[PDB]
Amino acid sequence: FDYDGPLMKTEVPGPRSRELMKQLNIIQNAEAVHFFCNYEESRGNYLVDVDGNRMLDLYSQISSIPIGYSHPALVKLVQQPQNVSTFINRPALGILPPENFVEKLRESLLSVAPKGMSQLITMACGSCSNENAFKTIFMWYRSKERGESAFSKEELETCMINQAPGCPDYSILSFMGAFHGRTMGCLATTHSKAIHKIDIPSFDWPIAPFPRLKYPLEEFVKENQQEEARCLEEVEDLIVKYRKKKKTVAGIIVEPIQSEGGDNHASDDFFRKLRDISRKHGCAFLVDEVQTGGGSTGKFWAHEHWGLDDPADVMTFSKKMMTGGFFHKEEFRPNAPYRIFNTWLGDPSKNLLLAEVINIIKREDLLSNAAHAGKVLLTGLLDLQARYPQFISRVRGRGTFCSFDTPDESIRNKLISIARNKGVMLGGCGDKSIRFRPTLVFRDHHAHLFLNIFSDILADF
Amino acid sequence: FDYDGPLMKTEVPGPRSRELMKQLNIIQNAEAVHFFCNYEESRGNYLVDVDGNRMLDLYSQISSIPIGYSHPALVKLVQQPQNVSTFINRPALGILPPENFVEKLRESLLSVAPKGMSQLITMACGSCSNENAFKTIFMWYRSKERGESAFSKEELETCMINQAPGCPDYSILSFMGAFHGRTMGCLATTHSKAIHKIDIPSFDWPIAPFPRLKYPLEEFVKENQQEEARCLEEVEDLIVKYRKKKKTVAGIIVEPIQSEGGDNHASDDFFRKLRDISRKHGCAFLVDEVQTGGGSTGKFWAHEHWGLDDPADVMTFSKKMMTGGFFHKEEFRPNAPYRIFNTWLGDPSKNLLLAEVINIIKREDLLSNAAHAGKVLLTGLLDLQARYPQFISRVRGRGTFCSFDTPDESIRNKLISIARNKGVMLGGCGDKSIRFRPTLVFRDHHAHLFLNIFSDILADF
Numbered sequence: 001f002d003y004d005g006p007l008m009k010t011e012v013p014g015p016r017s018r019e020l021m022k023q024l025n026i027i028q029n030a031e032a033v034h035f036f037c038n039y040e041e042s043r044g045n046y047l048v049d050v051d052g053n054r055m056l057d058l059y060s061q062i063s064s065i066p067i068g069y070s071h072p073a074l075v076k077l078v079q080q081p082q083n084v085s086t087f088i089n090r091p092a093l094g095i096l097p098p099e100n101f102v103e104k105l106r107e108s109l110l111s112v113a114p115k116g117m118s119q120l121i122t123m124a125c126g127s128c129s130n131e132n133a134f135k136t137i138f139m140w141y142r143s144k145e146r147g148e149s150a151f152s153k154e155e156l157e158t159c160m161i162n163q164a165p166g167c168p169d170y171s172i173l174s175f176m177g178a179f180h181g182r183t184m185g186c187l188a189t190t191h192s193k194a195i196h197k198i199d200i201p202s203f204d205w206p207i208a209p210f211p212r213l214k215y216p217l218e219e220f221v222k223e224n225q226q227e228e229a230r231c232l233e234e235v236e237d238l239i240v241k242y243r244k245k246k247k248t249v250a251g252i253i254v255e256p257i258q259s260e261g262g263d264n265h266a267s268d269d270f271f272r273k274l275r276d277i278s279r280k281h282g283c284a285f286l287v288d289e290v291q292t293g294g295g296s297t298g299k300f301w302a303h304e305h306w307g308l309d310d311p312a313d314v315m316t317f318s319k320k321m322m323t324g325g326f327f328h329k330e331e332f333r334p335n336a337p338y339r340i341f342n343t344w345l346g347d348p349s350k351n352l353l354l355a356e357v358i359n360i361i362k363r364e365d366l367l368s369n370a371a372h373a374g375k376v377l378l379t380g381l382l383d384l385q386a387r388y389p390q391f392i393s394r395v396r397g398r399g400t401f402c403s404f405d406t407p408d409e410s411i412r413n414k415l416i417s418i419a420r421n422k423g424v425m426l427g428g429c430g431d432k433s434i435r436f437r438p439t440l441v442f443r444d445h446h447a448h449l450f451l452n453i454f455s456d457i458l459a460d461f
Numbered sequence: 462f463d464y465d466g467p468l469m470k471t472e473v474p475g476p477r478s479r480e481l482m483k484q485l486n487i488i489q490n491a492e493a494v495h496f497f498c499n500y501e502e503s504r505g506n507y508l509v510d511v512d513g514n515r516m517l518d519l520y521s522q523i524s525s526i527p528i529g530y531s532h533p534a535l536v537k538l539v540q541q542p543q544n545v546s547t548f549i550n551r552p553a554l555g556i557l558p559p560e561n562f563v564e565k566l567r568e569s570l571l572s573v574a575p576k577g578m579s580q581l582i583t584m585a586c587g588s589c590s591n592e593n594a595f596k597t598i599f600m601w602y603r604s605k606e607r608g609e610s611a612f613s614k615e616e617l618e619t620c621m622i623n624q625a626p627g628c629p630d631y632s633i634l635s636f637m638g639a640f641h642g643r644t645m646g647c648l649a650t651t652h653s654k655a656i657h658k659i660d661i662p663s664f665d666w667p668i669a670p671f672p673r674l675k676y677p678l679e680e681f682v683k684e685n686q687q688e689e690a691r692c693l694e695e696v697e698d699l700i701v702k703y704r705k706k707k708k709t710v711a712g713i714i715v716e717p718i719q720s721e722g723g724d725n726h727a728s729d730d731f732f733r734k735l736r737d738i739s740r741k742h743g744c745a746f747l748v749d750e751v752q753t754g755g756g757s758t759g760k761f762w763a764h765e766h767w768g769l770d771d772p773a774d775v776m777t778f779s780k781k782m783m784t785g786g787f788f789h790k791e792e793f794r795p796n797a798p799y800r801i802f803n804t805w806l807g808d809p810s811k812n813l814l815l816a817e818v819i820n821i822i823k824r825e826d827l828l829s830n831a832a833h834a835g836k837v838l839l840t841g842l843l844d845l846q847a848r849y850p851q852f853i854s855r856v857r858g859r860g861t862f863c864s865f866d867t868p869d870e871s872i873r874n875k876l877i878s879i880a881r882n883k884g885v886m887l888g889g890c891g892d893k894s895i896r897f898r899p900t901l902v903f904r905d906h907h908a909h910l911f912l913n914i915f916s917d918i919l920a921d922f
């Protein structure tokens with residue numbers, strides 16, 4: 001369900017986008033705006049802008065569109081008279097859930113639960129997903145320390161005024177290069193770009209190095225083992241050190257592939273050993289699959305590649321999943337209500353969409369497709385790397401979750417700008433990487449279409 | 462548009478709710494669930510549950526349903542073919558807004574901008590609204606201090622690893638009794654109930670007393686003035702104290718009426734003077750209208766009662782507004798992009814609904830209606846207070862934003878439970894208060910429906 005290919009009329013942003021950008025800039029800083037879109041005319045992998053340009057979208061709204069624009073199955077959903085209520089009657093889900101709440105969850109999120117995690121709480125975005133995952137971990141850790149006993153009077157009084165022992169000085173360990181969100185808890189575990197962090201108060205929490213692999217992988221096996229081993233050791237040293245500082249690490253958060261920090265990969269071995277280190281020190285292992293989740297790596301959750309029956313304690317998600325939330329082990333279930341809570345806790349209308357999305361992913365075998373189409377894309381990227389080593393390096397990926405580096409930021413930006421005017425939307429990450437986040441209806445021939453367009457771009461560059 | 466009265470079939474929760482609650486409790490702690498709802502049959506002021514009970518809803522999903530259930534105008538929006546894309550193609554608004562983004566904002570949020578605030582950023586909930594308001598304020602304050610100097614190399618370095626000077630030790634001043642959300646920045650400014658705070662790490666930020674008025678107001682004129690004056694003094698002393706601690710107060714956050722902490726009111730004079738204190742010390746004045754905003758006090762924003770051309774620097778909202786976000790003064794506009802940002806920044810489908818909600822609020826004169834229906838409700842509560850002083854005290858309100866105290870938490874809960882079985886849904890707040898948050902289609906006759914039901918309950922209690 002889509003178009004024959006891209007179709008360009010103007011440079012991007014064109015005159016109509018620039019006019020709208022001017023208008024928007026009156027009421028807010030609109031410098032980040034790429035262009036304005038005609039979503040009504042957008043279909044599948046193709047995004048249409050207000051100047052009528054039709055572009056192959058390989059960025060998919062920062063990796064948040066699961067099965068393409070204007071998907072017919074979703075159109076049908078909105079058209080059904082029985083579904084009107086779900087769009088106009090938003091519940092305070094924590095206290096007054098709709099009749100079909102549990103059954104819709106069975107049809108969607110529960111049908112793709114990670115191994116070992118029977119519990120699920122929903123949230124509206126990745127940031128509150130992670131924030132509440134932190135809180136779940138903090139109260140679990142305190143539960144271990146206090147055992148089956150009541151809150152003390154001192155705890156109940158001091159927590160109201162932001163003081164210990166009611167408010168503990170627990171920490172969450174994160175990695176350099178990580179991105180976990182922008183609210184002030186999330187942000188403390190984020191180490192992506194200075195502009196995300198500067199001028200905002202933070203937490204003194206431990207920050208570990210994330211492995212920086214050397215490419216091609218075939219030539220640096222030993223170097224890369226040594227790099228991962230070094231990082232694992234520093235993780236353990238940090239845990240020990242912060243326990244001594246009386247800032248006990250209650251949890252470790254990591255992405256299976258670091259996105260905003262520059263598509264940084266690491267071996268499955270690294271993550272298995274990281275999981276073990278976490279368990280060994282009594283740390284909750286929190287896997288952030290807000291961006292890797294939803295199938296683009298070839299399996300529904302990227303951590304599935306690790307092949308563990310006990311992959312993690314908590315796993316957050318959002319973006320492609322339409323709603324946010326987190327799965328977790330039964331032992332992390334809050335002991336009392338109103339500790340993990342907010343007004344909306346997601347939105348049943350997003351669950352409605354998600355059930356149909358998961359139905360499409362399964363019926364059309366889109367996990368296999370992502371593996372296959374991703375192989376085609378990565379193969380082509382390796383070929384272009386060979387042919388253009390002065391522009392392309394560190395080609396890397398899993399499924400369609402691929403990326404490469406350019407010599408510098410200006411070349412990176414120029415390549416994105418040229419590709420866009422040629423009908424292909426690409427994302428950047430880090431200071432000089434280009435990344436791919438195609439929707440799940442991205443096929444072989446889209447990979448070939450991109451590769452052939454980019455090939456001629458490089459030839460003329 | 463509405464039913465004509467409650468109709469009860471069973472106890473609440475009834476057998477079908479209890480069954481669904483048992484199912485949900487398998488996958489998560491479901492102890493907060495009141496009952497399960499049939500939103501398809503709910504209409505106007507009435508919530509229908511899965512056991513067929515029809516209740517007059519005076520709690521409105523924690524004050525978040527603006528013009529009642531299944532409003533025919535919202536029904537017709539979802540039925541329009543041209544609106545289908547808005548519900549199934551959700552954009553990364555910060556980079557790729559839809560063509561109609563600015564116009565739909567003109568039809569909705571911009572048409573009710575607070576005085577003096579030309580800027581608007583949208584967010585998906587109250588918590589990230591407040592979080593990003595804090596961040597806007599921190600960046601503004603730092604910008605004041607560094608003048609036209611650029612980011613120092615040291616700041617750019619240290620901010621990446623959660624260290625000063627890149628991460629300043631700025632504080633937000635908040636009030637005892639406040640509720641501003643659940644994410645870790647918000648939570649530090651929240652001082653509502655211990656169960657919201659316990660076992661979660663916090664910030665050492667200043668906490669001021671919020672005035673506790675004495676009732677009847679007419680008999681405590683001098684006392685209430687002195688109480689408010691005392692609280693103002695303690696605020697100013699805190700700002701000074703924390704400047705010395707090198708934890709400079711960059712902003713002050715306050716609710717025009719404290720909700721979760723027990724519907725605590727203060728005079729318009731108090732807030733005007735608090736605003737003056739904020740400006741005097743160069744603190745941003747942040748008004749949280751997430752719960753007071755959207756008309757139930759008789760004015761669209763509760764701070765409008767204060768009568769100021771310059772009521773605040775930043776004002777956050779959510780709930781009735783369908784979307785969250787914050788308005789702010791031009792001088793608080795972020796200097797660079799990607800500092801206030803996240804994946805979705807709200808949802809255009811909420812803006813679509815909100816434009817129609819605001820149209821209805823204006824055409825049906827619902828601000829004035831809330832002032833009237835609220836006066837009728839308050840008058841009846843005062844009658845019940847006079848007749849039942851063993852149970853009812855401190856009756857108070859503005860518009861339909863009303864409340865009263867009971868003798869203890871046990872009685873508070875019993876009255877709510879009995880009212881519900883008698884066909885009226887009430888909310889609690891604080892330790893022993895009962896509150897009202899009726900939808901904006903709550904009329905004087907609904908006030909009398911409630912009052913007659915509750916009169917009978919009190920006579921038999």
Ligand SMILES: Cc1ncc(COP(=O)(O)O)c(CNc2csc(C(=O)O)c2)c1O
Pocket residue numbers: 062125126127128130179180181182255259260288289290291318319799802803804805
């Ligand atoms: C791994 C990971 N964890 C958490 C988040 C936060 O999700 P949202 O709060 O934006 O929904 C994200 C969101 N992605 C994202 C990429 S850049 C953008 C930003 O805020 O600048 C946000 C994520 O990729």
Ligand SMILES: Cc1ncc(COP(=O)(O)O)c(CNc2csc(C(=O)O)c2)c1O
Pocket residue numbers: 338341342343344523586587588589591640641642643716720721749750751752753779780
């Ligand atoms: C004045 C005020 N400020 C901020 C918020 C946070 O909004 P949400 O994050 O819940 O959307 C709220 C939300 N209201 C609310 C009432 S109790 C509930 C909770 O989390 O327990 C949340 C609010 O009333």
Ligand code: FES
Pocket residue numbers: 123124125126127128129183584585586587588589590644
């Ligand atoms: S923090 Fe997730 S929607 Fe506001």
